């Protein structure tokens, strides 16, 4: 099913073998994060919002760290790193208020 109200950001990722960056689309929602291909316009792989452990925000590049799900590391070049970091923090605050232990 397709949800209403999705925020998309322009990010670049490096390919294996050669040392060059290529354009990529990233769709972030209030429940999960997913990567969309610019050429085929389809989803390749996705991760849950509650499975994220820690993240680092730099002026030109964003970094992500997963617990017991991914083996390698996810790194991409973002133009609006401060806007993406504030969006993820706010989504976690809404879940804690609804499901409190």
């Amino acid at each position: 099913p397709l949800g209403s109200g999705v925020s998309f950001f322009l990010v670049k990722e490096k390919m294996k073998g050669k040392n060059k960056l290529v354009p990529r689309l990233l769709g972030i929602t209030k429940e999960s994060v997913m990567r969309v291909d610019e050429k085929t316009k389809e989803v390749i792989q996705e991760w849950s919002l509650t499975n994220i452990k820690r993240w680092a925000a730099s002026p030109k590049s964003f970094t992500l760290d997963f617990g017991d799900y991914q083996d390698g590391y996810y790194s991409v070049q973002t133009t609006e790193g401060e806007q993406i970091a504030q969006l993820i923090a706010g989504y976690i605050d809404i879940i804690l208020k609804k499901k409190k232990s």
Partner: protein, 34 residues
């Protein structure tokens, strides 16, 4: 044909240099007490 050896070196160097000198942030879902 023209070869590029200045834009690719400056873009990759700035990406990896800022990658290791970034500040880490922890989420409140894993930690209970702060």
């Amino acid at each position: 044909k023209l070869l590029i050896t200045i834009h690719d070196r400056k873009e990759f160097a700035k990406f990896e240099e800022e990658r290791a000198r970034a500040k880490w942030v922890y989420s409140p879902l894993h930690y209970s007490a702060r």
